[PDB]
């Protein structure tokens, strides 16, 4: 009886129930609250050596493994969720996307424009919500739905 995409789960380390969204890879403790023509998102991309284009403004030759990229993503998610860092700050500094220079903002978009896992996560996010790691041919994304 959750907004589709959501399932109940159990913390392995604490035993407390939590909720996990298999479209956004978001996870949270509270029972989730519960589509538009367009959404607006920012993202932080970490590329890896199997990215469609393993290069970025940060690195001419991206050589980190997918596993290493996921660990970087996971670390950014932790710092964002703790408030130690802001999403926009980490995107500006560390996103392997040209959108880093705009704090990760991609602007508004419809279905059919973005890579499908990105599109599905973006449209499943609530306004203001952040994704977990989202995988595309570009790399691994943290997605923030801003509108």
Ligand X SMILES: O[C@@H]1C[C@@H]2[C@@H]3C[C@H](O)[C@H]4[C@@H]3C[C@@H]2[C@H]41
Residue 63 in contact with residue 55, Cβ under 8 Å?
A: no
Helix (H, G, I), strand (E, B) or coil at 67: helix
Determine the size of the site formed for ligand X (CB under 6 A): 3
**Residue 42's Cα: distance from chain center in Å?**
9
* Selected binder of ligand X within 15, 67, 82, 83 (CB under 6 A): 67
Q: How many residues does the chain have?
A: 147
Is 97 an active-site residue?
Answer: yes
Stretch that binds ligand X, among 15-23, 27-35, 62-70, 108-116 (CB under 6 A): 62-70
Is 48 an active-site residue?
Answer: no
Stretch that binds ligand X, among 8-16, 51-59, 66-74, 92-100 (CB under 6 A): 66-74
Smallest separation, CB 132 to ligand X (Å): 11
Of the candidates 41, 42, 97, 131, the residue annotated as catalytic is: 97
Q: Is 66 in the site for ligand X (CB under 6 A)?
A: yes
Alpha helix locations (H) across 1-147?
Answer: 66-82, 87-94, 116-124
Q: Is 70 in the site for ligand X (CB under 6 A)?
A: yes
Q: Is 102 exposed, middle or buried (0-12, 13-18, 19+ CB in 10 A)?
A: middle
Helix (H, G, I), strand (E, B) or coil at 140: strand
Q: Which residues have a catalytic role annotated?
A: 43, 97, 115, 138, 141
Task: Name the site residues for ligand X (rule: CB under 6 A).
Answer: 66-67, 70
């Amino acid at each position: 009886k959750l907004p589709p995409g959501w399932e109940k789960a159990m913390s392995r380390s604490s035993g407390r129930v939590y909720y996990f969204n298999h479209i956004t890879n978001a996870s949270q403790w509270e029972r989730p609250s519960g589509e538009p023509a367009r959404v607006r998102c920012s993202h932080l991309l970490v590329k890896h050596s199997q990215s469609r284009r393993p290069s970025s403004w940060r690195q001419e030759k991206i050589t980190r493994t997918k596993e290493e990229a996921l660990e970087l993503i996971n670390g950014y998610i932790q710092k964002i969720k703790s408030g130690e860092e802001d999403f926009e700050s980490l995107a500006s500094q560390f996103s392997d996307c040209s959108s880093a220079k705009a704090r990760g903002d991609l602007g508004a978009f419809s279905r059919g424009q973005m890579q499908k896992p990105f599109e599905d996560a973006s449209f499943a996010l609530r306004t203001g919500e952040m994704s977990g790691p989202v995988f595309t041919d570009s790399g691994i994304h943290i997605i923030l739905r801003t509108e």
